[PDB]
Protein backbone atom coordinates (compact mmCIF):
# COMPACT_ATOMS: atom_id res chain seq x y z
CA UNK A 1 0.00 0.00 0.00
CA UNK A 2 1.41 3.36 -1.10
CA UNK A 3 -0.42 5.29 1.63
CA UNK A 4 0.83 2.78 4.21
CA UNK A 5 4.39 3.54 3.14
CA UNK A 6 3.57 7.26 3.19
CA UNK A 7 2.39 7.14 6.80
CA UNK A 8 5.28 4.84 7.75
CA UNK A 9 7.88 7.22 6.31
CA UNK A 10 6.03 10.18 7.85
CA UNK A 11 6.60 8.54 11.25
CA UNK A 12 10.36 8.95 10.80
CA UNK A 13 11.50 12.21 12.37
CA UNK A 14 12.27 15.08 10.02
CA UNK A 15 10.48 13.31 7.16
CA UNK A 16 7.43 14.48 5.19
CA UNK A 17 5.78 11.35 3.83
CA UNK A 18 7.48 9.45 1.01
CA UNK A 19 9.06 11.00 -2.09
CA UNK A 20 10.34 8.74 -4.86
CA UNK A 21 12.54 9.85 -7.76
CA UNK A 22 12.68 7.82 -10.97
CA UNK A 23 15.60 7.43 -13.40
CA UNK A 24 14.64 10.73 -15.06
CA UNK A 25 15.54 12.75 -11.96
CA UNK A 26 11.93 13.99 -11.67
CA UNK A 27 10.28 12.71 -8.46
CA UNK A 28 7.37 10.37 -9.15
CA UNK A 29 5.95 11.62 -5.83
CA UNK A 30 5.44 15.22 -4.70
CA UNK A 31 6.17 16.12 -1.07
CA UNK A 32 8.55 19.13 -1.07
CA UNK A 33 9.11 22.28 -3.12
CA UNK A 34 9.06 21.25 -6.77
CA UNK A 35 11.94 23.23 -8.39
CA UNK A 36 14.39 22.64 -5.55
CA UNK A 37 13.48 18.96 -5.25
CA UNK A 38 13.77 18.38 -9.01
CA UNK A 39 17.15 20.09 -9.44
CA UNK A 40 18.55 18.47 -6.31
CA UNK A 41 17.20 15.06 -7.35
CA UNK A 42 18.83 15.39 -10.76
CA UNK A 43 22.09 16.07 -8.93
CA UNK A 44 21.55 12.96 -6.78
CA UNK A 45 20.83 10.93 -9.93
CA UNK A 46 24.07 12.09 -11.55
CA UNK A 47 26.10 11.26 -8.46
CA UNK A 48 24.52 7.83 -7.96
CA UNK A 49 25.12 7.02 -11.64
CA UNK A 50 28.79 7.99 -11.38
CA UNK A 51 29.14 6.10 -8.07
CA UNK A 52 27.54 3.11 -9.80
CA UNK A 53 30.13 3.39 -12.57
CA UNK A 54 32.98 3.37 -10.05
CA UNK A 55 31.59 0.52 -7.96
CA UNK A 56 31.16 -1.50 -11.16
CA UNK A 57 34.76 -0.64 -12.06
CA UNK A 58 36.08 -2.88 -9.26
CA UNK A 59 32.92 -4.66 -7.99
CA UNK A 60 30.93 -5.75 -11.06
CA UNK A 61 28.44 -7.69 -8.89
CA UNK A 62 27.57 -5.03 -6.29
CA UNK A 63 24.33 -3.08 -5.84
CA UNK A 64 23.69 0.29 -4.21
CA UNK A 65 20.78 0.74 -1.80
CA UNK A 66 22.35 2.79 1.01
CA UNK A 67 24.30 6.06 1.04
CA UNK A 68 24.78 8.31 4.07
CA UNK A 69 25.18 11.94 2.95
CA UNK A 70 25.05 13.96 6.17
CA UNK A 71 25.95 17.60 6.76
CA UNK A 72 25.83 19.63 9.96
CA UNK A 73 22.21 20.60 9.14
CA UNK A 74 20.46 17.57 7.63
CA UNK A 75 21.06 14.08 6.26
CA UNK A 76 19.73 12.41 3.11
CA UNK A 77 19.33 8.68 2.70
CA UNK A 78 19.10 7.78 -1.00
CA UNK A 79 18.08 4.26 -2.01
CA UNK A 80 17.89 3.02 -5.62
CA UNK A 81 16.22 -0.33 -6.20
CA UNK A 82 16.27 -0.39 -9.99
CA UNK A 83 14.36 2.78 -11.07
CA UNK A 84 12.73 4.14 -7.90
CA UNK A 85 15.21 6.17 -5.84
CA UNK A 86 13.78 6.82 -2.39
CA UNK A 87 15.16 9.97 -0.76
CA UNK A 88 14.50 10.78 2.88
CA UNK A 89 15.68 13.94 4.64
CA UNK A 90 16.35 13.23 8.31
CA UNK A 91 17.94 15.31 11.03
CA UNK A 92 21.17 13.88 12.52
CA UNK A 93 19.57 13.90 15.99
Amino acid sequence: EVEETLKRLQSQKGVQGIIVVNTEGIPIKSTMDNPTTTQYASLMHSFILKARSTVRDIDPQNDLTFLRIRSKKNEIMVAPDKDYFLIVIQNPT
Partner: peptide
Protein backbone atom coordinates in the same frame (compact mmCIF):
# COMPACT_ATOMS: atom_id res chain seq x y z
CA UNK B 1 6.96 -5.87 -4.08
CA UNK B 2 10.71 -5.35 -4.51
CA UNK B 3 10.33 -1.60 -3.96
CA UNK B 4 8.27 -2.11 -0.80
CA UNK B 5 10.72 -4.67 0.59
CA UNK B 6 13.63 -2.33 -0.16
CA UNK B 7 11.84 0.61 1.48
CA UNK B 8 10.96 -1.44 4.56
CA UNK B 9 14.53 -2.68 4.90
CA UNK B 10 16.15 0.74 4.53
CA UNK B 11 13.68 2.37 6.92
CA UNK B 12 14.05 -0.36 9.55
CA UNK B 13 17.84 -0.11 9.28
CA UNK B 14 17.78 3.71 9.43
CA UNK B 15 15.53 3.72 12.52
CA UNK B 16 18.57 3.74 14.81
CA UNK B 17 19.85 7.29 15.26
CA UNK B 18 22.74 8.51 17.40
CA UNK B 19 24.56 11.79 17.90
CA UNK B 20 27.94 12.35 16.28
Amino acid sequence: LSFFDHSTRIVERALSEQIN
